[PDB]
Design a protein around this ligand. Structure first.
Ligand SMILES: COc1cc(-c2cncc(-c3ccc(C4CCN(C)CC4)cc3)c2C)cc(OC)c1OC
Ligand SMILES: COc1cc(-c2cncc(-c3ccc(C4CCN(C)CC4)cc3)c2C)cc(OC)c1OC
Ligand SMILES: COc1cc(-c2cncc(-c3ccc(C4CCN(C)CC4)cc3)c2C)cc(OC)c1OC
Ligand SMILES: COc1cc(-c2cncc(-c3ccc(C4CCN(C)CC4)cc3)c2C)cc(OC)c1OC
Lengths: 290, 286
């Protein structure tokens, strides 16, 4: 039995509800009929028992229901009342400890996705962004929305790109996604798209960390250089034509933590995808930063 | 706000196999059938789910879809398919202990042909559908409804435009000559299997006080759980086909059905009747 209590999000994706189940809050996503291939892909990903991780949104159930010509598509997960990282960063500043806890937790989730377990295939997310990261009461985050994920098994030489014509959130798309030169039959290509997007999320978080009494306001990546509601071509212009990267506020260079983070986000943003850091290397670097 | 009642009471197990189990269940005011998949057969749940996420099939001669459910457990994933419940059970079951008259035999086989033609046909536009081949048609995958018509079940191996049951495999599957890049190839494999089902049913139709006992196709030439090689020798090398008893040739309906089944069993897949032509032929019998 589930009771739908309130809508906590509505968009082109569908809707998410806070519900009650066995006396616990749960999140219930009802997909738009336009996004049925995301529902199925997310269901394929959550079939993997060894996907479970403290920094990946926890799955409870997936349903496809129908009577007559009407179909409903449901995903039920754990509920995080603090909401997404995008929501959280607009109303909170961070100290060093909280900033590093958040970004290490995301690195930990992403390295868990990317690294094959011999089981869980290697997984690239393809739509990493601050709205797809939830904040937990322990100060860590978990990564959500596996509808665009790609899976790879090294042991069997199999690449499963799925069938979904959805593309990533335009603001977070890597240069090779925006210029459509990405190597679509290469698993490493998709991991390197995630690394680009992770760099952008690092920047979004680091802006909110106070140093020397200074903090930046929350802004999304490329807020200063594209229109509101940027198109694919708007993003291609700034990233591929103009070679734009998010600006590093000069106040960061007075703080050792933010100086380390600036270095790390620049190594996520090389135009050459093979130059970018791995998720494991980011996790190891953040583990060593204080 | 909205209560989403998902509790299904599993009341009795009506099937157990390598596939997993089927249960009669209760949801609210509907009996439902619940297929709980074995780990062995997880791909069948994914394929049927992917198909129903692509096209919501609705046809009187297709087992009615209700839900696909995936539930997280401590150490495993539980996969359920929920459908309409047909208390009379499978055609295989039904033919063991029931004989048929002319009307009941024709109603059964025309309903199966109707369901199969619906799968096979591509319909264009909104409320259309891709062409579908079943790939495991047999009497255990057909349910009997109270109104005398049947419905086709189990789209776990279906293809849209982990091998089928060996006893029902067409010669081109057994000799590995099937044109695997040609969608029509898969329709023609279903037609072969349909012809075998038509033979199983026709045997149980009474004429002049005579009926055959229920037997499965090739019961007289292969063992139980026949091997791939056993089937290939019968169907491909020796080119055997099920026996038509002499008593059929005294009955106009069984004479017509014998001709139909032989046009489903040509070695050359492209010579076989289409499901639509089978329907037309069946509507002109009696
Ligand atoms: C999955 O299966 C079963 C489901 C249900 C069921 C329960 N609540 C609500 C609904 C429903 C209401 C309204 C719409 C539409 C109406 C028109 N437009 C506005 C789009 C929305 C759709 C669906 C249903 C269909 C009942 C069943 O049996 C009686 C089911 O079968 C077991
Ligand atoms: C990203 O993706 C998925 C997310 C979730 C999910 C899980 N816990 C909590 C939430 C949430 C709750 C509340 C808010 C607040 C934020 C501030 N604002 C002013 C009011 C609303 C935001 C977010 C969500 C959205 C579930 C999903 O599936 C069931 C997701 O899809 C995989
Ligand atoms: C998640 O899981 C299961 C759900 C159900 C089920 C139970 N009550 C009501 C529903 C329902 C149907 C349809 C709508 C429509 C209403 C109008 N429109 C604008 C959008 C949505 C709402 C609610 C469902 C789908 C049954 C199950 O089993 C038979 C489920 O488990 C497989
Ligand atoms: C072929 O495959 C599927 C079949 C079904 C299904 C649907 N209605 C009814 C049944 C059934 C009910 C009752 C009896 C017995 C019980 C009492 N008596 C001793 C003889 C009759 C047998 C069978 C089934 C098995 C559901 C499925 O999925 C949920 C199937 O898989 C796609």
């Amino acid at each position: 039995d589930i009771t739908l209590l309130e809508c906590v999000g509505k968009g082109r994706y569908g809707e998410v509800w806070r519900g009650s189940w066995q006396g616990e809050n749960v999140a219930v996503k009802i997909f738009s009929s336009r996004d049925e291939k995301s529902w199925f892909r997310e269901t394929e990903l959550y079939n993997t028992v060894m996907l479970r991780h403290e920094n990946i949104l926890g799955f409870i159930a997936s349903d496809m229901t129908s009577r007559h010509s009407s179909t409903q598509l449901w995903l039920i997960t754990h509920y995080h009342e603090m909401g997404s990282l995008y929501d959280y960063l607009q109303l909170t500043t961070l100290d060093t400890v909280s900033c590093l806890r958040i970004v290490l937790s995301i690195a930990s989730g992403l390295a868990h996705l990317h690294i094959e377990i011999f089981g869980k295939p290697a997984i690239a997310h393809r739509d990493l962004k601050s709205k797809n990261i939830l904040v937990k009461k322990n100060g860590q985050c978990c990564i959500a929305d596996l509808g665009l994920a790609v899976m790879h098994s090294q042991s069997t030489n199999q690449l499963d790109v799925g069938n979904n014509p959805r593309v990533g959130t335009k603001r977070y798309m890597a240069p090779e996604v925006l210029d459509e030169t990405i190597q679509v039959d290469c698993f490493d290509s998709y991991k390197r798209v995630d690394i680009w997007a992770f760099g952008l999320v690092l920047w979004e978080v680091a802006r909110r960390m106070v140093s020397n009494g200074i903090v930046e306001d929350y802004k999304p990546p490329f807020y200063d250089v594209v229109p509101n509601d940027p198109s694919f071509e708007d993003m291609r212009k700034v990233v591929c034509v103009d070679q734009q990267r998010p600006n590093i506020p000069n106040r960061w260079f007075s703080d050792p933590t933010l100086t380390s983070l600036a270095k790390l986000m620049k190594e996520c943003w090389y135009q050459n995808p093979s130059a970018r850091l791995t998720a494991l290397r980011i996790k190891k670097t953040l583990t060593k930063i204080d």
